[PDB]
Design brief:
The PDB classes it as transferase. The entry lists the keywords Kinase, kinase inhibitor, Complex, Structure based drug discovery, transferase. The assembly is dimeric. RIP2 Kinase Catalytic Domain complex with N(4,5dimethyl1Hpyrazol3yl)7methoxy6(2methylpropane2sulfonyl)quinolin4amine. 2 copies of one chain form a homodimer. The first copy, chain A, has 9 helices and 10 strands. With 282 residues, chain A is an alpha+beta fold. Chain A has a single domain, classed as Transferase(Phosphotransferase) domain 1 (Transferase(Phosphotransferase), domain 1). In chain A, the strands form 3 sheets. In chain A, strands 2-3-4-6-5 form a 5-stranded antiparallel beta sheet, covered by helices on one side. A two-stranded antiparallel ribbon of chain A has the order 7-10. Chain A has a two-stranded antiparallel ribbon with strand order 8-9. Chain A is globular. Chain A starts with a strand and ends with a helix. Chains A and B meet through strand 1, helix 1, helix 3, helix 8 and helix 9 of A and strand 1, helix 1, helix 3, helix 7 and helix 8 of B. Strand 1 of chain A pairs antiparallel with strand 1 of chain B. Bound molecules: the ligand COc1cc2nccc(Nc3[nH]nc(C)c3C)c2cc1S(=O)(=O)C(C)(C)C (2 copies).
Chain lengths: 282, 280
């Protein structure tokens, strides 16, 4: 029966408000809270903003973007969260000039924390299904620890890129929106993307042509060029990817199964290697 | 009107339960959550008032959620067992970091200043709540350190909405205030910058209490606070105003933070990372 209320933040308490990005969800800005003396992120532009705040507030966990409050005024409506200084996983994987090396321990830690975050959502009462996982909404804190964001399409078990969407979701309905095998598919594509640092379906022009290929059973390429033979635990990771993005949803594993497979892999990395991987990025 | 409920954790979902420490508040054990696959910490203990105290602590932790407050994950509320489940802090307490000198020969200045800044950020947040939450039991022992040595404030047993060690207690509190936490903070600051035990040459805690009531404080000289400390004069000023005999002369955490902000800006981000790697 222990209940915590989300604080209401007056818009005038946000100082040094600076534009970060503009998306479908709305505009993201950075700011500093004048009383709390911390940096914050603000997602702004009704019911859909409040629904996302409610989900973030209820789904609080170590690998979920921490919500600090809501701006609910006639003048302004926005979601206030902790500021993620290292942006998104998408930026880390594809900004190769900015990041020439992303050490294996760190890539494996990121994959483990994404699975830990999604598993938590799935274990809630009732289960919370993300349904829009992408490298763009896997955010990175000051020490490159994962924070999952974007709960706009996230539904309680009661436009942009399609590369993380299972083929059965292309023509939606009751069954597809209800599916508990959607997030694992997205996770399988993210895993491939993290281990290769390549754009899934890079050689395909139209995203509609990607959709046609995926429905036939075609997936991002698994070979020596995309996934080199020097990748730690390559065979095990390939097995996880291929089961995760299987055409038949029934053949895709649960996040629990995924985590039990990843735990021995993560134990082979000494703690200092995670620290060294992060310093290499600065 | 957005409300979040604290999850109830069945005791059987806590695997590898191992003793860590025993305190006045209760026993602390480490464990792993069988479904969530994460390491956790459990603070556990049979009386109506004793049960109510644990529920009070869990309520405070749940309501006072913030970046520098120990994150609560759930409550174990069973006939068989009653406990508070939180994130596991792998680096223990600030007390251990400052005084285990063989384990930690160097604690670089950027990290010491970052710790001091995060303690002030955490306490300021508590003070800014509606109504204000006053810690009233700040000590180096309940300043916990996460995997990257970021601060998490714990122990909300004595924390009130507006025993043990007396070294962090203002003299007016001996015979029973929004000016208690700043006093504790001033002692913690001295302790962080010196790595010495406050009043180390005293054989009885009553001798500390008598000294403090007479306006005497931990020594500030070249031996305790060397001349090579970054921003030494400013830090000494903060310490001395923070532990002033007259509570009215002690600053607010807002003032304290405005004082610390330019100090923290002089350190490049990579120096914090290098300070942590030096500890491993
Ligand atoms: C450094 O760039 C960003 C930092 C962010 N920190 C926290 C949250 C962000 N976005 C967000 N998602 N959902 C909510 C409710 C909020 C505030 C952040 C977003 C960015 S960004 O927009 O520049 C990026 C890296 C995603 C393009
Ligand atoms: C590594 O040692 C500890 C880690 C801890 N991690 C999280 C919480 C702890 N204590 C706690 N305080 N309040 C609550 C509700 C809880 C669970 C931790 C305590 C320890 S310890 O007891 O070994 C130490 C370092 C304080 C002596």
């Amino acid at each position: 029966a222990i209940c915590s209320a989300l604080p209401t933040i007056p818009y005038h308490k946000l100082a040094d408000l600076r534009y970060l990005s503009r998306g479908a969800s709305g505009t993201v800005s950075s700011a500093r809270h004048a009383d709390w003396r911390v940096q914050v992120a603000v997602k702004h532009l009704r019911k859909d903003v409040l629904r996302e705040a409610e989900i973030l507030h209820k789904a609080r966990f170590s690998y979920i973007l921490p919500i600090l409050g809501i701006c609910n005024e006639p003048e302004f409506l926005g979601i206030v969260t902790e500021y993620m200084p290292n942006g998104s996983l998408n930026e880390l994987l594809h900004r190769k000039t900015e990041y020439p090396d992303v050490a294996w321990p760190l890539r494996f830690r990121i994959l483990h924390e994404i699975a830990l975050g999604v598993n938590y959502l799935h274990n809630m009462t009732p289960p919370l299904l993300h349904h829009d996982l992408k490298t763009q909404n896997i955010l990175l804190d000051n020490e490159f620890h994962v924070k999952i964001a974007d709960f706009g399409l996230s539904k309680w078990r009661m436009g942009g890129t399609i590369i993380y969407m299972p083929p059965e979701n292309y023509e939606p309905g009751q069954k597809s929106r209800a599916s508990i095998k959607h997030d694992i598919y997205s996770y399988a594509v993210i895993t491939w993307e993290v281990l290769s640092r390549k754009q899934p379906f890079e050689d395909v022009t139209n995203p509609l042509q990607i959709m046609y290929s995926v429905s036939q059973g075609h997936r991002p390429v698994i070979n020596e060029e995309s996934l080199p033979y020097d990748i730690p635990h390559r065979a095990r990771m390939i097995s996880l990817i291929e089961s995760g993005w299987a055409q038949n949803p029934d053949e895709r594993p649960s996040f629990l199964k995924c985590l039990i497979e990843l735990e021995p892999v993560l134990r082979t990395f000494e703690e200092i290697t995670f620290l060294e991987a992060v310093i290499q990025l600065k």
